[PDB]
Write a protein that binds this DNA or RNA. Structure first.
Ligand SMILES: [K+]
Ligand SMILES: [K+]
Ligand SMILES: [K+]
Ligand SMILES: [K+]
Ligand SMILES: [K+]
Ligand SMILES: [K+]
Ligand SMILES: [K+]
Ligand SMILES: [K+]
Ligand SMILES: [K+]
Ligand SMILES: [K+]
Ligand SMILES: [K+]
Ligand SMILES: [K+]
Ligand SMILES: [K+]
Ligand SMILES: [K+]
Ligand SMILES: [K+]
Ligand SMILES: [K+]
Ligand SMILES: [K+]
Ligand SMILES: [K+]
Ligand SMILES: [K+]
Ligand SMILES: [K+]
Ligand SMILES: [K+]
Ligand SMILES: [K+]
Ligand SMILES: [K+]
Ligand SMILES: [K+]
Ligand SMILES: [K+]
Ligand SMILES: [K+]
Ligand SMILES: [K+]
Ligand SMILES: [K+]
Ligand SMILES: [K+]
Ligand SMILES: [K+]
Ligand SMILES: [K+]
Ligand SMILES: [Mg+2]
Ligand SMILES: [Mg+2]
Ligand SMILES: [Mg+2]
Ligand SMILES: [Mg+2]
Ligand SMILES: [Mg+2]
Ligand SMILES: [Mg+2]
Ligand SMILES: [Mg+2]
Ligand SMILES: [Mg+2]
Ligand SMILES: [Mg+2]
Ligand SMILES: [Mg+2]
Ligand SMILES: [Mg+2]
Ligand SMILES: [Mg+2]
Ligand SMILES: [Mg+2]
Ligand SMILES: [Mg+2]
Ligand SMILES: [Mg+2]
Ligand SMILES: [Mg+2]
Ligand SMILES: [Mg+2]
Ligand SMILES: [Mg+2]
Ligand SMILES: [Mg+2]
Ligand SMILES: [Mg+2]
Ligand SMILES: [Mg+2]
Ligand SMILES: [Mg+2]
Ligand SMILES: [Mg+2]
Ligand SMILES: [Mg+2]
Ligand SMILES: [Mg+2]
Ligand SMILES: [Mg+2]
Ligand SMILES: [Mg+2]
Ligand SMILES: [Mg+2]
Ligand SMILES: [Mg+2]
Ligand SMILES: [Mg+2]
Ligand SMILES: [Mg+2]
Ligand SMILES: [Mg+2]
Ligand SMILES: [Mg+2]
Ligand SMILES: [Mg+2]
Ligand SMILES: [Mg+2]
Ligand SMILES: [Mg+2]
Ligand SMILES: [Mg+2]
Ligand SMILES: [Mg+2]
Ligand SMILES: [Mg+2]
Ligand SMILES: [Mg+2]
Ligand SMILES: [Mg+2]
Ligand SMILES: [Mg+2]
Ligand SMILES: [Mg+2]
Ligand SMILES: [Mg+2]
Ligand SMILES: [Mg+2]
Ligand SMILES: [Mg+2]
Ligand SMILES: [Mg+2]
Ligand SMILES: [Mg+2]
Ligand SMILES: [Mg+2]
Lengths: 64, 146, 118, 205
RNA sequence: GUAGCGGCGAGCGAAACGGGAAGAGCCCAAACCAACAAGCUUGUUGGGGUUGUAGGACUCCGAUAUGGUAGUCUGUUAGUAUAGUUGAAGGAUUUGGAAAAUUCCGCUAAAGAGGGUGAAAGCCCCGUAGACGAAAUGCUGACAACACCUAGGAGGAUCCUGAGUACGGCGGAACACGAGAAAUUCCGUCGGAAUCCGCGGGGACCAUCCCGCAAGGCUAAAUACUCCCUAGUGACCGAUAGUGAACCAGUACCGUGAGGGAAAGGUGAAAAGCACCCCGGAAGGGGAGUGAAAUAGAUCCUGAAACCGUGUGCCUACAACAAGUCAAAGCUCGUUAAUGAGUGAUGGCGUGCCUUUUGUAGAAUGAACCGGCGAGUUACGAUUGCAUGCGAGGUUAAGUCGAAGAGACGGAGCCGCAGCGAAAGCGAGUCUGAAUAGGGCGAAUGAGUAUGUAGUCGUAGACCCGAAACCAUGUGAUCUA
RNA sequence: UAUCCGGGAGUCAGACUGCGAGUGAUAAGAUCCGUAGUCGAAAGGGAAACAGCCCAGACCACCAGCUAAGGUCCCAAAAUA
RNA sequence: GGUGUAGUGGUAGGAGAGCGUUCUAAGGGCGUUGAAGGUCGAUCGUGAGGACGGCUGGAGCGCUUAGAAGUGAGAAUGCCG
RNA sequence: UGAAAUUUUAGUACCUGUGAAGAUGCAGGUUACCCGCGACAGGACGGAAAGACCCCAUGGAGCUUUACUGUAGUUUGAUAU
């Protein structure tokens, strides 16, 4: 059958022009009093899926 | 060629590797699977992305965004492609489809100013970038929003 | 496209058995025992092709020693004297001379002793 | 290029010119090989099957209890290691046919025809007419043309008498100009074609 | 594998548009009319009428045609299925028991498919190409007959257009959609409409707009499947394989029963299957015969290995041996003629194979021996390498024709040529931001795509064997309570 | 030789010896780290035999030679130096 | 192809190149003047393995190129004999 | 007349030692002519049974309850009849 996409990932990541995956940041939900304003400001910014994680999951997003 | 003298192109075909066919082949006995463990079992192995119980990456990361139901995407065209036509030519979505430049127009043709245009043209398209319109008109052409 | 067992199996096993001719009972009759024994024979054969060189050098040394003693010398003194006198005749030829050409060996011993004296 | 045109009697008329784009190309050996292999695979029927332990008759119960009997543990008398047990994997019905890109197909056909012409194994005849089908007459025609090896006889549509009279000869393979394949051309050592057949081929390609 | 659904986990997963295969549309209920019967309506009958650019009744007009059918054991006719007839062409020579083989000259072919015949046959036989053939009975198609449907225009004053229905509350269920913001469909229960200025739907809901007209019915074709019958096919099996079953197989056998379930093919061209004689009670042999061959004698083709035995060239009764290997006298023998072969006193070294282990000669595991069988495969997807074609392009899918082929058509669709943003949106840029700032992701700085092949992965039993168990039909109180 | 990009893995039971520590009793062929080696996955020579110690890394042939650890009276090669 | 230099222990495992089995296609062959198969031999190659003789056997089978796999067994207290 | 369990092949000694730490098989030494028969049971960690004790598996089953979540029944109300 067709290989299925991992819908959870599909909701959480975006494919970029160069083939990489754009991702949000963790620790950006609640308990902000526990984090300095610097942490909140720098977690507001997006990031990219690391090489190791990508090599584990790429097959789940082949047809995303 | 002759049916009794066939020869495939070099490197076009390879010999399948068969495992579990003696030690000297390099995949005898264990068949390359190693020694015991889950990955050595028939049908063994964990599901993709599994991390042995550590919270997987997607679980760590939050969902984001939404899909607009009324989302509109445009088939993009650049000035370099427009250079392929002759001066005075009337560029139309039909013309592009016939020329094969745009097989799927999506919500419509939008013209972008990536390259340098050199021909005078009357261009009809769903949309034009501001730079694209300026370039077309500076080249003595005209733009019409179909 | 079925490939039944055929005759390759018998051919291979028969080669092993023929290699095992002369062994004791099942070790030449039975393929499994024969193969296990043939492998050990290969191990011993490879190891002995090296040990054989050691054995013959040991034998030549012993014979040369006896001959040297008869000529009034030890093996070690004889070889030291020969090295001093620049004699390159090896132990195989020396042992052959000792057994067969006693006069030649005695002449060699005389030159060795003279070199030692000098 | 140009090929000597022969009359059915065997006397040569003036040459004729064939489209270079079809008969004048440099043959592409690798493309030709691919077409041959693909066509040969397509001919396979692929009807072959075996019974795995699920398909073999019976074999439901456990032969003997898991422990105590002193025998090797077993699950069914039809397990693959059992005599009469199911087959592990093995053939299953499937198709071997695949399709090449249209451009590759066309190149392969042009390559075989161009190769025949270059070797001068392409014999063009003005026309093949037989008042009635007679294999002896057609065999004499081959003799007149001085063809004795394997021959592919390419006839225009409707030349039924020629087709019938030629087909039974052991070295002759008859095909209509509209239905000609890389395998047919490659198999044949010489290609005997009528002029109308060549015209129709040039139109097709 | 998109939109979505989902302890938003594991997973589940559409539809419309577009391209094709095939195509076909029709009947009632009601209004109203006529008759009938009872009890002005109210049931039966026939007419009437069938719908959304609203239709119909009803009232005016005009036509009594025009076409169609998915009907009929109605014939007539053709074809076809179920037996069949015909159907070309070779003799010699060599080997042989036997010719089809070999050799020499021929012949036939709309037939050189195939099978058989004393070995391998175009020309010996059955056939094949081709031609021809049906009393009888089905099947199909036509033709006719019979039959059944088939009216246009203009008006709306009034009447009809499916009720315990639609719909709602509660509780479930089906929709990819798990109650969720949740339409749409259905079930049970309770409540419960409107009716043309009407009603339903366009994913809660409302307004506008658009589309349609439920609560009645029928309908061929494209589609699914093959116990069977006919004719064939196979880089499918070839007697541990292939059906369990090539053979008197669902048999023998097992079980109370449900149920489980085997083994077992081959003389020879032809039985010509050994007359007769001899030993023996026979069995079985030895002759004599048959035969090309009987060491092809029915346990019958070939006849491996384990295993058992006869004969003997060498060695062996002072030796402690994983049984070999290395060195070697003697004896025996003479080959794919090789600085040969068998045996071997004696001497040196030397704790099997496998699995599993930090480590096994291991007193850890597995194998009694021999033979056969017995484990990474296929399909559909993902990705990478290699190869080929084309190249800012690449490519067709279903489907039609065609030999179950190639191939042709088929451009719908998919990938790539533009990205950035959650999105509106902008675009070689874009997002964040007050910002011409910085920064992120991109462009500058371009190669892709179709197919083949190989590696790996995903979905499938997914490399093979193995549970204790779980669930759903059945069979058992002939033992025992 | 290092990087970096990509295809394919196996490994997550380690053992002992020397040196530096802990735990233990300044016990253990104990246990737990650090560090080097060997075994693991390494045949050969020495340590009687003896994975982990000493010497040393087998592509092969030789009835050639020089050495390492370790040895030279006999078993047993070489000094009754 | 020659010379030179260097290198060539190895489990898990990666890469490369080959041997052999059945079948398909094509070509070219061999077979009652004896195929396959069986058996013996002192034969060839670096390896899987390949020939050639004698005997047995009695009718099919190699070789070259390419293609496809039910393609290789010694172990599973494996199954059958 | 005629089985069976077992069985890697066995020309199958003792002592001390070594070794995966309890050796017929390894080292050193000792003893021992070849083949059996009738007896015994020290050893072959002898055979028989993939230990039931012990631990482990995100195994199974039966059982318990104020474990969690359901549920047959029982009961109470609304509502229809
Ligand atoms: K995210
Ligand atoms: K958080
Ligand atoms: K592997
Ligand atoms: K999909
Ligand atoms: K979960
Ligand atoms: K009517
Ligand atoms: K005949
Ligand atoms: K025939
Ligand atoms: K009839
Ligand atoms: K709903
Ligand atoms: K709607
Ligand atoms: K509608
Ligand atoms: K016979
Ligand atoms: K004998
Ligand atoms: K010996
Ligand atoms: K044990
Ligand atoms: K900026
Ligand atoms: K920027
Ligand atoms: K390419
Ligand atoms: K590929
Ligand atoms: K499987
Ligand atoms: K797999
Ligand atoms: K009873
Ligand atoms: K790597
Ligand atoms: K240490
Ligand atoms: K032979
Ligand atoms: K297999
Ligand atoms: K076995
Ligand atoms: K042990
Ligand atoms: K005992
Ligand atoms: K139980
Ligand atoms: Mg928030
Ligand atoms: Mg902190
Ligand atoms: Mg392949
Ligand atoms: Mg390996
Ligand atoms: Mg193995
Ligand atoms: Mg294992
Ligand atoms: Mg492990
Ligand atoms: Mg593992
Ligand atoms: Mg946890
Ligand atoms: Mg086998
Ligand atoms: Mg040496
Ligand atoms: Mg079953
Ligand atoms: Mg047993
Ligand atoms: Mg079977
Ligand atoms: Mg005839
Ligand atoms: Mg002839
Ligand atoms: Mg549902
Ligand atoms: Mg309701
Ligand atoms: Mg509704
Ligand atoms: Mg409308
Ligand atoms: Mg139908
Ligand atoms: Mg069978
Ligand atoms: Mg057989
Ligand atoms: Mg059977
Ligand atoms: Mg015989
Ligand atoms: Mg026989
Ligand atoms: Mg004595
Ligand atoms: Mg003696
Ligand atoms: Mg252990
Ligand atoms: Mg055992
Ligand atoms: Mg009962
Ligand atoms: Mg009863
Ligand atoms: Mg320790
Ligand atoms: Mg290990
Ligand atoms: Mg060592
Ligand atoms: Mg070891
Ligand atoms: Mg020296
Ligand atoms: Mg000495
Ligand atoms: Mg002294
Ligand atoms: Mg080395
Ligand atoms: Mg064969
Ligand atoms: Mg196999
Ligand atoms: Mg076996
Ligand atoms: Mg010890
Ligand atoms: Mg001991
Ligand atoms: Mg020993
Ligand atoms: Mg033992
Ligand atoms: Mg025991
Ligand atoms: Mg156990």
């Amino acid at each position: 059958p067709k290989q299925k996409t991992h819908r959870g990932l599909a909701k959480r990541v975006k494919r970029t022009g160069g083939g990489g995956l754009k991702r949000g940041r963790a620790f950006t939900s609640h308990r902000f009093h526990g984090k300095t304003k610097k942490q909140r400001r720098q977690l507001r910014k997006a990031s990219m899926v690391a090489k190791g994680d990508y090599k584990r999951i790429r097959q789940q997003l082949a047809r995303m | 060629m002759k049916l009794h003298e066939l020869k495939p192109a070099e490197g076009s075909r390879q010999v399948r590797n068969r495992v579990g066919r003696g030690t000297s082949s390099g995949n005898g006995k264990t068949a390359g699977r190693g020694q015991k463990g889950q990955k050595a079992r028939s049908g063994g192995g964990v599901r993709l992305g599994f991390e042995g119980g550590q919270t997987p990456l997607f679980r760590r990361l939050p969902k984001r965004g939404f899909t607009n139901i009324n989302r509109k995407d445009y088939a993009v065209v650049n000035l370099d492609t427009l250079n392929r036509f002759e001066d005075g030519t009337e560029v139309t979505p039909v013309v592009l489809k016939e020329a094969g430049i745009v097989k799927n127009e999506k919500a419509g043709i939008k013209v972008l100013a990536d390259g340098e245009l050199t021909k005078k043209l009357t261009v009809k398209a769903a949309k034009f970038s501001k730079s694209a319109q300026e370039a077309i008109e500076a080249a003595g052409g005209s733009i019409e929003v179909i | 496209a079925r490939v039944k067992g055929g005759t390759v199996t018998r051919k291979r096993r028969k080669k092993v058995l023929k290699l095992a001719k002369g062994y004791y009972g099942s070790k030449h009759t039975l393929f499994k025992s024969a193969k296990e024994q043939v492998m050990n024979s290969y191990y011993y054969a490879f190891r002995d092709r090296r040990q054989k060189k050691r054995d013959f050098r040991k034998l030549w040394i012993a014979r040369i020693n006896a001959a040297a003693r008869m000529n009034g010398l030890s093996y070690s003194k004889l070889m030291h004297g020969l090295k001093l006198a620049e004699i390159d005749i090896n132990r195989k030829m020396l042992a052959d001379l000792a057994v067969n050409d006693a006069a030649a060996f005695t002449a060699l011993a005389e030159q060795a002793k003279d070199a030692l004296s000098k | 290029p140009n090929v000597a045109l022969f009359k059915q009697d065997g006397t040569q008329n003036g040459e004729i010119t064939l489209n270079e784009e079809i008969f004048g190309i440099e043959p592409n050996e690798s493309v030709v090989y691919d077409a041959i292999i693909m066509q040969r695979a397509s001919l396979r029927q692929g009807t072959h099957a075996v019974k795995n332990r699920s398909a073999v008759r019976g074999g439901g119960r456990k032969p003997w209890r898991q422990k105590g009997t002193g025998r090797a543990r077993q699950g069914s008398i039809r397990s693959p290691q059992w005599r009469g047990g199911g087959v592990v994997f093995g053939p299953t019905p499937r198709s071997y046919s695949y399709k090449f890109p249209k451009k590759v197909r066309r190149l392969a056909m042009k390559s075989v025809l161009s190769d025949k012409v270059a070797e001068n194994n392409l014999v063009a005849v003005e026309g093949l007419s037989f008042d009635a089908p007679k294999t002896k007459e057609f065999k004499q025609v081959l003799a007149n043309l001085s063809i004795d090896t394997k021959v592919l006889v390419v006839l225009e549509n409707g030349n039924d008498f020629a087709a019938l009279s030629a087909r039974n000869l052991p070295n002759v393979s008859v095909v209509t100009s509209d239905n000609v394949s890389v395998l047919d051309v490659v198999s044949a050592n010489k290609v005997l074609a009528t002029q109308t057949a060549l015209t129709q081929i040039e139109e097709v390609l």
